[PDB]
Design a protein around this ligand. Structure first.
Ligand SMILES: *[C@@H]1O[C@H](CO)[C@@H](O[C@@H]2O[C@H](CO)[C@@H](O[C@@H]3O[C@H](CO[C@H]4O[C@H](CO)[C@@H](O)[C@H](O)[C@@H]4O)[C@@H](O)[C@H](O[C@H]4O[C@H](CO)[C@@H](O)[C@H](O)[C@@H]4O)[C@@H]3O)[C@H](O)[C@H]2NC(C)=O)[C@H](O)[C@H]1NC(C)=O
Ligand SMILES: CC(=O)N[C@@H]1[C@@H](O)[C@H](O)[C@@H](CO)O[C@H]1O
Ligand SMILES: *[C@@H]1O[C@H](CO)[C@@H](O)[C@H](O)[C@H]1NC(C)=O
Ligand SMILES: *[C@@H]1O[C@H](CO)[C@@H](O)[C@H](O)[C@H]1NC(C)=O
Ligand SMILES: [Ca+2]
Length: 1111
């Protein structure tokens, strides 16, 4: 039974299932939230002891209280598995811990639940018992996780642990108060004392087992490698799926355990060149072996396939399709109507401007308004192609308002196919709107018979009516739904909201004709024709019935906002997937009639990308109302081994439950694993996550089952990771002339400590990031030059904007997608100075390792420095590359060798080109993020390449003058003569480019961090790496070649030859006056005992130390 298991746990305690279901079910819908909060305070959910039963009962009430329908209920199941609401809950707790507790003056008892009213806290429902003044920051501030119910003078906030029924009476009272209309009610959470500090188990990530031995090519103990028959493997693998008759199940089993059955392909006449003719699909559309996903016609991408991203996309697109299915269309017709070529041509440098609203929606809610307004219907003799539903909003008290209505009336006289509606929107509460509307609703029949303007003004004063209260109520709802101010003039044809109107001179009779003409060309005609092509021109029978379709389709052109995503607003509905014949390469799963969601996947089985897509897709199909047509299109061109890994996705469509009812954790277990093959563990985690290994026995970088069978006795690999941080990342800009405010330094703070974190603004589109967990934070400019020239106006937490209400320098993260920011900073008047120009411990060494040999020699590196130094040395490392076995042991090194150590990390920016091999990633962390990795307090760092023996006091290098250089290096030895043929750096390319500069070595170096930032070296390293990374062959060693190619622009200080020694280019005599030896590559265990005699001495010191701790 050879298996490997990987599980992921969050950096916070599990909030009870009770509160999670409340927040997940009432996703955001506050009306659902309080109707369920009432039922949990009633006592209906008290019998739910086993968390599964609690979930079970929530299904009953959601469906029974009308809150959820089966189609959207399946989405509830999947989102609940994902535990989407847990970080939202932890935000309340962190806020309670950092802002609420300190302000709460006095000792709490019986105050498990308490209200906050006017700076006073009350622990009793009676309101007569006030425990204390709520000092410090006022907690009545509007925060994202809040939920406002009712309007009131008093602002009531209930901090509750809902697990105890003691909350129930407090709620009922506040609920009564809010429903009466005396106060605005909002619910915040208190860390429930019934639940334990058991970390939360997360899902929605992927695991990879990379066979690092990929040099092979010309149940199963080793990876079988074939000759030049690779070419067809993708093709026969695809046929193997069709032959199976459990197709997407085969696709998964084959794609996830690819190496296993790799050579077994091309056997038992699976040659099946049936889909060879199926390239009729290829012959007209997209290339062989290309990965393309679509959702209702829209363009889906590789990393829009994180479970979190998909859940919000289903939710938004079901709402869009359901808006269309109120118009009598099927899921397939609705999508084909939306994803039609006539529609795509209406859309497609940089340019955009517009505002539109739903016609179906607005005429349903505002019934007593829209069926009681003066309606001049379009004469039934007008053609389908002429129909339009003009709706005019106007203040009939002012001349400009009544002038626009007159111009609309004259326009209706000329255009037969227009249904004209007039809604009175006054700005004075004394004149009830219902009376002026009913004044002209009497003259509705006699409307448009107005020759002079005075005829309308006189008709407004004739008659006397009663203020129809029902009318006024539906009017207020309309203006709120449509975001229309009182007394403002608006013109809305077919849903396209246009206005407000400044003066009625802007909009005359002739201007209305043109508005119909332009709207007709864009949203009316392409609908009629796309509609007539699909044989659905029967559904459009009336000016109003037509407008509902044209209006919905235009709204399908608005994408995200983008929150969490960077894809601002494109996605053009395509339709060419339909030309492809679905005989061989395609298979479908789900009913095409009841499906609201249409996933059209085009995956190549020989691709590594296909592995993830398939794994997610199975889970996505398990939602009642999701259709999936999977196209398999392989390529004939496979020069190397197509897939170089094993892959599993941790995700479930239905919530997992323990035997005791609690939530069951989701794990990635790989079965029938070869015992002879070398493996590496990698994580396929969503963009906002920072993940490092927690507890593991087996070296995550160097693995083989047969070896741990010979060490532990079992073939069961088990490891744990931690989602340690969630990113707060953003793109900075300058106000008003949008530029890159590079060199700007930032501080993240909380009401707990104001020096939480610090980073600097990057040159590539203003990138910055912070490693944080759910909670309320603030962002201030770092103490100094950043605050001098710049003042941060806002952190764009709501969108690019500016958005009214986003000028808050406050950030709060409450999602597994983090919080994407678009801050805006304006310069202080009359200045134009950049930070670049002005108006800790003795030694600071940093290192990294990625193997137990490198880790054993890293223990030696630390020990060698301390033996030869009488100074305060501090070690800095990259958290995630080290094994947990090494991480468990470093505090014991710190105590025995007398050093301190702080552990840094940074997540590779999404824009920056990543490296697939673990090795190439290692190299990038040494050179690319030096400026941002360390806090702004650290003056200088020194890198020592882990497998090293230092014999000199390293303080000398600290105070070595660099002379205008941000970093200093040790050069290549030209001492050994016999290896001159190997000295490539003094030849052709490296000789012409390096005119006289020496080839420096990326093994030992000094970084004067304050000069590094001052010079902005990192940004130049990063952007140069960018275009060079197109060919990985140019970056032979990106840690070494990058500073060497950049010594022409970024200065390189040269360090003495005594500092660096190698057993290939420096003579043995140099070792006498040695400072550091890299133990040069081209194994190390032999070279260490041979070159350095004291290497054994250090190894043995460590060996005893671990056993000393052991007892
Ligand atoms: C945010 O959340 C709220 C709350 O869920 C939603 O508001 C809902 O708005 C509508 C209009 O007021 C309510 O509609 C309800 O329709 C029920 C009938 O539905 C059936 O229709 C077909 C018939 O063929 C069936 O096939 C189908 O299965 C449906 O079941 C009525 O029975 C409802 O009456 C009463 O229901 C509940 C009791 O169960 C009461 O709490 C209500 O007050 C109501 O008197 C009702 O007419 C819907 O119920 C509203 N909810 C509430 C609680 O008021 C929002 O739409 C939602 N928004 C989003 C974006 O999710
Ligand atoms: C993708 C594909 O092969 N489609 C073919 C099409 O080209 C052909 O015209 C039609 C009738 O023979 O059958 C089908
Ligand atoms: C089975 O494979 C052989 C070799 O490719 C082929 O000649 C034969 O025709 C195949 N069988 C059938 C029934 O086509
Ligand atoms: C460290 O300090 C001791 C005591 O002052 C001194 O004897 C020793 O020489 C120092 N170490 C080195 C390497 O000089
Ligand atoms: Ca080394």
């Amino acid at each position: 039974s050879p298996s490997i298991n990987v599980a992921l746990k969050a950096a916070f305690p599990s909030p009870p299932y009770l509160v999670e279901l409340l927040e997940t079910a009432a996703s955001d819908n506050t009306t659902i939230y309080y109707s369920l909060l009432d039922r949990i305070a009633k006592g209906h959910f008290a019998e739910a002891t086993t968390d599964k039963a609690l979930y079970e009962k929530f299904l009953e009430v959601l469906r029974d209280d009308g809150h959820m329908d089966p189609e959207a209920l399946s989405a509830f199941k999947l989102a609940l598995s994902l535990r989407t609401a847990t970080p939202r809950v932890e935000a309340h707790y962190q806020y309670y811990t950092a802002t609420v507790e300190p302000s709460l003056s006095g000792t709490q008892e019986g105050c498990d639940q308490w209200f906050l009213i006017d700076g006073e806290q009350y622990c009793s429902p009676t309101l007569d018992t006030s425990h204390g003044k709520v000092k410090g920051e006022d907690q009545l501030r509007t925060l994202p996780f809040d939920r406002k119910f009712g309007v009131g003078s008093r602002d009531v906030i209930l901090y509750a642990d809902i697990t105890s029924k003691s909350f129930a009476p407090f709620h009922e009272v506040a609920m009564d108060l809010a429903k009466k209309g005396k106060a605005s009610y909002r619910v915040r959470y208190r860390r429930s004392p019934s639940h334990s500090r058991e970390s939360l188990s997360v899902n929605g990530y992927g695991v990879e087992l990379v066979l690092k031995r990929t040099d092979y090519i010309v149940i199963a103990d080793i990876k079988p490698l074939e000759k030049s028959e690779l070419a067809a493997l993708g093709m026969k693998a695809a046929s193997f799926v069709m032959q199976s008759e459990k197709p997407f199940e085969a696709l998964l089993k084959l794609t996830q355990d690819f190496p296993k059955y790799s050579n077994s392909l091309g056997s038992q006449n699976v040659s099946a060149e049936f889909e060879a003719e199926h390239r009729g699909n290829r012959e007209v559309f997209l290339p062989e072996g290309s990965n393309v996903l679509w959702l209702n016609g829209l363009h889906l991408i590789d990393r829009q396939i994180q479970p979190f991203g998909l859940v919000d996309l289903l939710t938004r697109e079901r709402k869009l399709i359901k808006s269309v299915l109120d118009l009598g269309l099927t899921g397939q017709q609705a999508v084909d109507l939306l994803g039609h070529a006539e529609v795509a041509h209406a859309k497609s440098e940089d340019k955009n401007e517009l505002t539109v609203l739903n016609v179906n929606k607005i005429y349903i809610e505002n019934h007593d308004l829209m069926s009681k307004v003066p309606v001049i219907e379009a004469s039934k003799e007008s053609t389908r192609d002429d129909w339009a539903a003009l709706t005019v909003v106007a203040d009939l008290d002012d001349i400009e308002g009544q002038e626009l209505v007159y111009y609309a009336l004259r326009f209706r006289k000329s255009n037969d196919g227009v249904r004209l509606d007039i809604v009175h929107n006054p700005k004075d509460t004394s004149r009830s709107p219902s009376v002026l509307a009913q004044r002209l609703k009497s003259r509705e029949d006699k409307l448009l018979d107005f020759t002079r303007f005075l005829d309308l003004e006189t008709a407004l004063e004739t008659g006397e009516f009663e203020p129809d209260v029902a009318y006024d109520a539906s009017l207020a709802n309309f203006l709120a739904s449509s975001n229309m101010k009182a007394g403002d003039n608006f013109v809305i044809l077919n849903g396209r909201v246009l206005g407000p109107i400044t003066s009625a001179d802007d909009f005359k009779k002739e201007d209305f004709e043109v508005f119909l003409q332009a709207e007709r060309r864009t949203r009316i005609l392409p609908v009629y024709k796309a509609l007539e092509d699909l044989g659905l021109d029967d559904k459009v029978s009336g000016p109003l019935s037509a407008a509902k379709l044209t209006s919905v389709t235009a709204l399908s052109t608005i994408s995200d906002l983008p929150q969490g995503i960077f894809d601002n607003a494109p996605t053009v509905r395509t339709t060419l997937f339909k030309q492809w014949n679905s005989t061989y390469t395609s298979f479908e799963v789900g009913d095409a009639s009841t499906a609201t969601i249409f996933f059209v996947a085009v995956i190549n089985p020989a691709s590594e990308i296909g592995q993830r897509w398939v794994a997610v897709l199975k889970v996505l199909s398990e939602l009642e109302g999701v259709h999936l047509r999977v196209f398999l299109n392989p390529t004939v061109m496979i020069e190397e081994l197509p897939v170089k890994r094993f892959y599993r996705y941790v995700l479930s469509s239905s919530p997992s439950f323990d035997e005791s009812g609690k939530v069951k954790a989701l794990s990635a277990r790989f079965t029938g694993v070869p015992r002879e093959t070398l493996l590496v563990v990698g994580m396929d985690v969503p963009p906002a996550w920072l993940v490092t290994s927690k507890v593991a026995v087996d070296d995550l970088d160097n693995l083989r089952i047969k070896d741990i069978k010979a060490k532990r006795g079992t073939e069961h690999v088990e490891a744990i990771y931690e989602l340690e941080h969630i990113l707060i990342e953003g793109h900075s800009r300058e106000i008003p002339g949008a530029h890159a405010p590079r060199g700007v330094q930032l501080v993240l703070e909380t009401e707990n400590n104001p020096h939480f974190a610090d980073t600097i603004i990057m040159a590539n589109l203003g990138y910055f990031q912070f490693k944080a967990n759910p909670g309320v934070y603030n962002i201030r400019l770092k103490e100094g030059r950043s605050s001098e020239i710049f003042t941060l106006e806002s952190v764009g937490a709501k969108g690019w904007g500016p958005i009214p209400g986003d000028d808050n320098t406050e950030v709060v993260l409450m999602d597994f997608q983090g919080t994407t920011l678009y801050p805006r900073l304006r310069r202080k008047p009359g200045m134009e100075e950049e930070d670049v120009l002005e108006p800790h411990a003795e030694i600071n060494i940093f290192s990294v390792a990625s193997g137990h040999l490198y880790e054993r020699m890293l223990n030696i590196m630390m020990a060698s420095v301390m033996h030869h130094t009488n100074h305060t040395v501090k070690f800095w490392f990259i958290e995630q590359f080290l094994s947990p076995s090494f991480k468990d042991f470093i505090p014991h090194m710190a105590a025995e060798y007398g050093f301190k150590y702080e552990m840094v990390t940074y997540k590779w920016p999404h824009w920056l080109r990543q490296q697939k091999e673990k090795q190439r990633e290692i190299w990038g962390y040494k050179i690319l993020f030096l400026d941002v990795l360390f806090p702004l307090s650290l003056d200088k760092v020194i890198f020592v390449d882990a497998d090293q023996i230092v014999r000199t006091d390293m303080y000398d290098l600290v105070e070595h003058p660099l002379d205008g250089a941000p970093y200093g290096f040790a050069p290549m030895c030209d001492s050994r003569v016999e290896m001159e043929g190997y000295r490539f750096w003094k030849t052709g390319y490296w000789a012409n480019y390096l005119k006289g500069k020496p080839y420096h070595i990326s093994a030992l170096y000094v970084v004067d961090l304050q000069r590094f930032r001052e010079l902005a070296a990192g940004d130049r390293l990063r952007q140069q790496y960018h275009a060079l990374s197109a060919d990985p062959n140019s970056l032979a060693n990106l840690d070494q070649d990058l500073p060497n190619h950049m010594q022409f622009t970024i200065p390189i200080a040269t360090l003495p030859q005594e500092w660096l020694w190698c057993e290939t280019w420096c003579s043995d005599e140099t070792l006498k006056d040695a400072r550091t030896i890299d133990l040069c590559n081209n194994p190390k265990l032999d070279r260490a005992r041979r070159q350095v005699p004291e290497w054994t001495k250090y190894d043995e010191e460590i060996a005893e130390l671990a056993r000393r701790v052991r007892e």
